[PDB]
Amino acid sequence: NETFEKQLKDLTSNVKSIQDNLLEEIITPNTKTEYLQRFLIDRFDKELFKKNVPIVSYEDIKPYLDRVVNGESSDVISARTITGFLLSSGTSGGAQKMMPWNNKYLDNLTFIYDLRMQVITKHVKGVEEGKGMMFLFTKQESMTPSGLPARVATSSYFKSDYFKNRPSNWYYSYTSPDEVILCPNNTESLYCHLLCGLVQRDEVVRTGSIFASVMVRAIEVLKNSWEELCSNIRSGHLSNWVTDLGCQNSVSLVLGGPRPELADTIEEICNQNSWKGIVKRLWPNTKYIETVVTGSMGQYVPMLNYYCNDLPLVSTTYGSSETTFGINLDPLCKPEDVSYTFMPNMSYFEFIPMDGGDKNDVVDLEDVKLGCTYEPVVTNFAGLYRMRVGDIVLVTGFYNNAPQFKFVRRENVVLSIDSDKTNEEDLFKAVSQAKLVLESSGDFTSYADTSTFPGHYVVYLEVELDEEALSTCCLVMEESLDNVYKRCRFKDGSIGPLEIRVVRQGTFDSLMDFFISQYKTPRCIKSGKALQVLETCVVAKFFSI
Numbered sequence: 286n287e288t289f290e291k292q293l294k295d296l297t298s299n300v301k302s303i304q305d306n307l308l309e310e311i312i313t314p315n316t317k318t319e320y321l322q323r324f325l326i327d328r329f330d331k332e333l334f335k336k337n338v339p340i341v342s343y344e345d346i347k348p349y350l351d352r353v354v355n356g357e358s359s360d361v362i363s364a365r366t367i368t369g370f371l372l373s374s375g376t377s378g379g380a381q382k383m384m385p386w387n388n389k390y391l392d393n394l395t396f397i398y399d400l401r402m403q404v405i406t407k408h409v410k411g412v413e414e415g416k417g418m419m420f421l422f423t424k425q426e427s428m429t430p431s432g433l434p435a436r437v438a439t440s441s442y443f444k445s446d447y448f449k450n451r452p453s454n455w456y457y458s459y460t461s462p463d464e465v466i467l468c469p470n471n472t473e474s475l476y477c478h479l480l481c482g483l484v485q486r487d488e489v490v491r492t493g494s495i496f497a498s499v500m501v502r503a504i505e506v507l508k509n510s511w512e513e514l515c516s517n518i519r520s521g522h523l524s525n526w527v528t529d530l531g532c533q534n535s536v537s538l539v540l541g542g543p544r545p546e547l548a549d550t551i552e553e554i555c556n557q558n559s560w561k562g563i564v565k566r567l568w569p570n571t572k573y574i575e576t577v578v579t580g581s582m583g584q585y586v587p588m589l590n591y592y593c594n595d596l597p598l599v600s601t602t603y604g605s606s607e608t609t610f611g612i613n614l615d616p617l618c619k620p621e622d623v624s625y626t627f628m629p630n631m632s633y634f635e636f637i638p639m640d641g642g643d644k645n646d647v648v649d650l651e652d653v654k655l656g657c658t659y660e661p662v663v664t665n666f667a668g669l670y671r672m673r674v675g676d677i678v679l680v681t682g683f684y685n686n687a688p689q690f691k692f693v694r695r696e697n698v699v700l701s702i703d704s705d706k707t708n709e710e711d712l713f714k715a716v717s718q719a720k721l722v723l724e725s726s727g728d729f730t731s732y733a734d735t736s737t738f739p740g741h742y743v744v745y746l747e748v749e750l751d752e753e754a755l756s757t758c759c760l761v762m763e764e765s766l767d768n769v770y771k772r773c774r775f776k777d778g779s780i781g782p783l784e785i786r787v788v789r790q791g792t793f794d795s796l797m798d799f800f801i802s803q804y805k806t807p808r809c810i811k812s813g814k815a816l817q818v819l820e821t822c823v824v825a826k827f828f829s830i
């Protein structure tokens with residue numbers, strides 16, 4: 286695989302020139318856009334670009350985005366025609382952010398998919414003849430006034446020929462038929478994922494999903510669905526409640542006919558006392574689990590390890606709605622040691638120092654410092670120039686001349702389970718809308734609880750008590766969160782009812798003691814030991830609905 290090795294060494298050594306070339310490739314055709322004309326960028330000139338083009342947040346350039354979303358010519362901001370939009374997890378004052386998009390995003394994405402396939406096969410053997418049980422989902426598109434579809438990045442891929450006509454090798458070979466993957470009903474599709482996977486269990490040499498929250502759900506759903514799956518296996522008939530015609534036709538063929546011996550074989554595996562190692566006992570030829578376990582997904586590692594008998598957890602890719610950033614070049618590492626190596630062909634990257642270790646104002650990709658934290662700044666192929674990503678990364682090293690980054694967190698996010706990234710700003714709002722029912726009927730922090738599936742939000746409050754009021758304080762707190770939450774909470778089942786746990790009096794003063802025992806009360810708490818002081822000063826619990 287000499288082509289790959291060469292390709293990678295080239296990418297990682299020539300970082301500076303590739304970036305400078307990329308920048309020219311983006312700027313040159315865009316010099317007559319309204320946006321670039323405004324900032325006097327009449328030619329490729331790197332210092333003029335850095336001097337005169339502003340660093341922006343989503344909010345700074347929103348009037349431009351709204352124009353294209355509403356139907357105005359793409360050439361306001363990009364001479365590469367905007368053919369759609371990406372719906373970000375991140376929000377802007379309630380609404381999801383809508384990033385401009387075209388097929389360059391998928392060119393980059395498929396480049397990354399091919400690259401990471403080569404990285405994986407270099408290190409992991411025994412996968413080239415098997416298939417993957419990948420829990421992949423399509424979310425249905427939202428329509429814009431322009432007539433262009435807004436989708437999630439990964440659905441932008443599934444709904445395209447980049448997916449339909451993908452390469453014909455092991456890495457693109459799944460136990461599930463494409464129809465299952467394309468099913469907009471994810472409850473139906475996940476059931477079918479499991480069912481097709483069980484049918485073809487011996488062939489499974491890997492499993493996973495984009496994020497670890499989803500792999501966890503696949504296993505929890507399996508636990509709650511296995512008797513039904515096995516009946517379908519026994520009979521050779523998919524269950525009637527699956528409405529999707531594509532799933533109906535496609536899964537029926539995988540089933541093929543009554544398999545009462547395979548059903549018994551699976552029933553007997555599932556009936557063991559413990560669920561420990563279940564993934565590997567049902568799919569014994571699995572070599573790894575392919576899923577993101579970095580950032581807030583790290584909270585799922587022990588559970589993954591429990592179900593998977595310490596199969597390697599390979600966390601390959603760091604990407605976003607603005608752009609795909611890069612990959613993990615050391616896939617067999619532990620999750621807490623995962624760094625992502627940005628690829629210089631993805632977009633032109635700058636970085637804003639988030640600490641004292643770098644006193645510069647903004648720096649190029651090749652100038653970032655070891656141990657230093659930065660916020661990435663992206664210039665891409667769809668009309669984004671020098672936009673803040675609102676993530677925080679830490680430089681852990683350099684692979685040749687390619688900086689490697691540990692993902693620290695998304696700026697301002699206090700609560701995450703699954704897809705939702707609830708910002709502090711969202712939590713103030715809702716806890717202002719709870720203060721009303723407490724101001725009429727009759728401090729605070731939060732934790733993300735994933736001890737049960739589905740994970741759920743926990744808010745501590747500092748007030749017997751009625752359960753009209755406090756139950757309705759759970760409700761308003763939920764209903765004032767974002768559409769990502771609500772899709773996760775009401776449609777997908779990735780999130781259960783928000784919990785309100787009332788603190789004792791003085792707990793919200795002896796909490797000012799907590800980090801004193803280390804002012805500003807945290808609106809989230811991760812510290813296991815400080816979860817202790819909270820969990821023992823609860824006088825009552827209440828939930829949403």
Ligand SMILES: Nc1ncnc2c1ncn2[C@@H]1O[C@H](COP(=O)(O)O)[C@@H](O)[C@H]1O
Nearest residue numbers: 373374579580602603604605606692695
């Ligand atoms: N590999 C990863 N590890 C941790 N967080 C990630 C990873 N990939 C993406 N993210 C987070 O998910 C976000 C996805 O962006 P968007 O598609 O706009 O919702 C990023 O901005 C990061 O905050």
Ligand SMILES: O=C(O)c1ccccc1O
Nearest residue numbers: 438439495602603604605
């Ligand atoms: O497509 C992916 O596999 C992916 C994974 C992590 C982040 C963004 C992504 O597009």
